[PDB]
Design an enzyme around this catalytic site. Sequence first.
Site, PDB file in Angstrom:
ATOM      1  CG  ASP A  35     -18.831 -37.784 -36.886  1.00 53.71           C
ATOM      2  OD1 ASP A  35     -18.370 -37.670 -35.724  1.00 53.71           O
ATOM      3  OD2 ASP A  35     -18.994 -38.889 -37.474  1.00 53.71           O
ATOM      4  CB  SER A 199      -8.822 -37.048 -19.847  1.00 59.70           C
ATOM      5  OG  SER A 199      -9.296 -36.544 -18.612  1.00 59.70           O
TER       6      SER A 199
END
Length: 330
Positions: A35, A199
């Site tokens: 994770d 992004s």
Amino acid sequence: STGSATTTPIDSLDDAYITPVQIGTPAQTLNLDFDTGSSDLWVFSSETTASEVDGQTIYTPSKSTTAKLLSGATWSISYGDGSSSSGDVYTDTVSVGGLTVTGQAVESAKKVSSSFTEDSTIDGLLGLAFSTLNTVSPTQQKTFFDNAKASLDSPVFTADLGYHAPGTYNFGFIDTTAYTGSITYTAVSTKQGFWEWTSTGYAVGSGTFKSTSIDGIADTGTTLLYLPATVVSAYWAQVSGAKSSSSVGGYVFPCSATLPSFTFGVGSARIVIPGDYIDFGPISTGSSSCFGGIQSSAGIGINIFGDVALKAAFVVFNGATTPTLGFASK
């Protein structure tokens, strides 16, 4: 040193991935959920409340000659999906894909929430976010990666998750045969303890690319892609009959639909998520309403590039003094 381990989806929907991990001496092999959005290595164990164990493999510290109680240390964690676990702490030898750390904090669960009990395939979590998020008290502990780092050939790990197929976690090296083209690297902020990056925008299907900054985290422990409501609305508007259902808890669409791809920007590069990756199947057995793999982050408080996004790429988690993230197509 290096390590290399295969990671395997737990079910037919790629809801999560498990990777075998050797703990203790002699080795006890547990299948852990790696994770990148948390920083605790915790396991089902001989200390876990018996009614909360249902098919998991447990770590038994008393059978390990290298286990030592970390006296006084406790831990307690709550995840974004509302699940939780807590317990005490041992140190022991932990190996992943041939890479060994001695003195690793292995957090032994006394209690786990229902979602963990109900998932017989996941024996615990191995956190790979920054150690500043580790929940051990009163002495915070380091992640497996943090402990391994100095011994690694290069201070990196990579995630290469499969679509309906096994993939790979590598530590200490970049497998140049595992991706196509070049890797595009992008800046990381560790301010919130995550692999947090921005992004450069998105496209829906064959549509034009929208340049827009989307801050979010690379999180292998989250199944879906969670993005701003504007972005998600633009995506689902291109699917006939798609709608957000408060009763179901997100966007659903007719199972007869063909889903468009979704592209996200990494600097000047583009990663394309095929439409099929965004299909999470019937909301319930036999239903003709299917659950979407792109959902709104509104009310999460953070955008999450979960498995739906990450499995479309070869992803480099660069833990050099100045951390960065790299993405390549594959």
